[PDB]
Structure 1
Amino acid sequence: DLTATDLARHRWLTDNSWTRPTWTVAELEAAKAGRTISVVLPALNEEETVGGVVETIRPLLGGLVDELIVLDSGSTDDTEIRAMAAGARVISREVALPEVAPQPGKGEVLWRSLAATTGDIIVFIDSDLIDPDPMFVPKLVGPLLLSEGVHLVKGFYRRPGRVTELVARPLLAALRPELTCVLQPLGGEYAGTRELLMSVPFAPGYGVEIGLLVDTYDRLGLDAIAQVNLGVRAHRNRPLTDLAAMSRQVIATLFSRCGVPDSGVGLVDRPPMNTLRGKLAAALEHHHHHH
């Protein structure tokens, strides 16, 4: 028999998931209604791929996309100069947020990018993608521009993911089962409103994606979360040591959000950016637990 989780998933997929997100660039630009869109590529030593990702987004710059930033995390290869030649604005962690010393990890980069961007919508795309497609950004922003109440859009790939299927999804089933409807909770391609992203803490390192997903859910529920199919992509092979470290941080971040203490046996969470920037901006929509 269907569970409450099953029923919620069915209707959430009907309303908030797009397998064929075929909005046109023209109709999305027309829907902006004065809102601006920033695209951020976090990057650490991605010289072979960063230019290719920038190249797929560059045609939107000056139309759908208002700024295209590579937030470099201290590369020692040619990541930064290749991003420049490909047509992006390269900003370091230190320039993005001068008053806070950096610490390692991807979450730090995305958090700092909130201070370096101005868009009402911020889109994150990994800089290590081997086969980026030019429609990633349109598909990610579609629900934010057209679907009332959506604040976070997760881009997923159809397959022709061990941490996702063995760690993230089973832990969500135990701790936040409604979120098992999200196909790829750890995915690096996603978009959010400034109102949402400035109001939540950012988990460090490999925990950033899952932390944003759970913080959004705990604040707004499933209604605020959407997902879109970015296309067919094969799984990329990562070393087991990388996967184990990713798993351990996914666990730590889930535990910190879900009331589970953690030994610390294996970086700190950053506070909402609205404690440092945009301090008087309008608050994220209320979602009351009392009446």
Structure 2
Amino acid sequence: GLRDTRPGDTWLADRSWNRPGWTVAELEAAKAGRTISVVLPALDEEDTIGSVIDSISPLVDGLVDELIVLDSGSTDDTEIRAVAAGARVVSREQALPEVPIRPGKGEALWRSLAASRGDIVVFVDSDLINPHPMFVPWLVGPLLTGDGVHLVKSFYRRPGRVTELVARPLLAALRPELGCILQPLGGEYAATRELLTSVPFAPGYGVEIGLLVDTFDRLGLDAIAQVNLGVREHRNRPLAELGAMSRQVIATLLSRCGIPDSGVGLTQFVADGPEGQSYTQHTWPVSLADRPPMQAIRPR
């Protein structure tokens, strides 16, 4: 099982595994009228985004029906670079003009539901480095092989601190059946539109874990598969942000578990100097505000 795993392998809930034998052509044939959107959330990702798009471009009008970059207020060259590589770029405003924007990653993913039309939506972060072209096929695989899977999470080898110290231990504590999930915070995952538009979306960095727990709570572990992506490189998230990320993962998880979170942000005390003679006090915002199911806003 986890003693012999090759990129593409699928772990189902009942501890059973599957090693896919389809070609991308064969996968495309298995769509059976269903459509697939790929969504790349992006915020100031000009160095890496073209490369990510390039790894997926070759599928467009084949396995992948549409490829969308959801631009979350970039001020660098993210937009023009994405267009040049052949992706459709949609801003937060364009995705859903009739709702004011809130900050954070979750907002962008939620808005991408309104911008996309695929019966299946695959999310891929636009800060991946050298992403394997099979990422998307591997993620859609368990969805097209009809066995009641609605959400496909990925796992991978880092060529993790908030995952290993915050998300996974808090899941053991509060949703222990989800202890089998190797990468609960991972930005590479696929789900059915029917699932995605039926659940609230957590704000900021709470989005991935929010979706995992909501899916589990509503459909059980059987609706969730995990796919080995193998080695996955990406850009380093800055170390300063990790406390804020942890705080938001906690807020989201507590809220899903029915535990009142204070809504008070993390105050970090940053030493001004090596002697620890003064500290700068930096309070990061945290949000308890989900977005409602997209079916409540822009229903199909």
| Residue matched to 1:273 | 294
1: CA distance, partners of 2:81 / 2:256: 38
When normalised by structure 2's length, the TM-score is: 0.86
Q: What amino acid maps onto 1:45 in structure 2?
A: D
| Residue matched to 1:79 | 78
1: CA distance, partners of 2:162 / 2:28: 36
- Indicate how the Cα distance of structure 1 residues 242 and 192 shifts in structure 2: closer, same or farther if over 3 A, else same: same
1:240 Cα deviation (Å)? 3.0
| Residue matched to 1:23 | 22
2: CA distance, partners of 1:238 / 1:67: 28
1:128 Cα deviation (Å)? 0.7
> Computing the radius of gyration over CA atoms, which structure comes out larger, 1 or 2?
2
1:241 Cα deviation (Å)? 2.1
- Indicate how the Cα distance of structure 1 residues 111 and 189 shifts in structure 2: closer, same or farther if over 3 A, else same: same
Q: Is the 8 A contact 1:51 1:86 kept in 2?
A: yes
| Residue matched to 2:6 | none
Identity of aligned residues (%): 79
Q: Which runs of 5+ in 1 are unaligned?
A: 1-9, 280-291
| Residue matched to 1:289 | none
- Indicate how the Cα distance of structure 1 residues 97 and 11 shifts in structure 2: closer, same or farther if over 3 A, else same: closer
2: CA distance, partners of 1:32 / 1:48: 33
Q: Is the 8 A contact 1:12 1:222 kept in 2?
A: yes
Question: What SS does the aligned partner of 1:53 have?
Answer: helix
1:147 Cα deviation (Å)? 3.6
| Residue matched to 1:202 | 201
Question: What SS does the aligned partner of 1:113 have?
Answer: helix
Name the structure with the higher helix share.
1
| Residue matched to 2:15 | 14
When normalised by structure 1's length, the TM-score is: 0.88
- Indicate how the Cα distance of structure 1 residues 243 and 22 shifts in structure 2: closer, same or farther if over 3 A, else same: farther
> After alignment, is 247-256 or 126-135 more displaced?
126-135
Q: Is the 8 A contact 1:45 1:79 kept in 2?
A: yes
- Indicate how the Cα distance of structure 1 residues 149 and 87 shifts in structure 2: closer, same or farther if over 3 A, else same: same
Question: What SS does the aligned partner of 1:59 have?
Answer: helix
Name the structure with the higher strand share.
2
> Residues 1-291 of structure 1 correspond to what in structure 2 (within 5 A)?
12=13, 14-15=15-16, 21=20, 23-233=22-232, 237-266=236-265, 267=287, 268-278=289-299
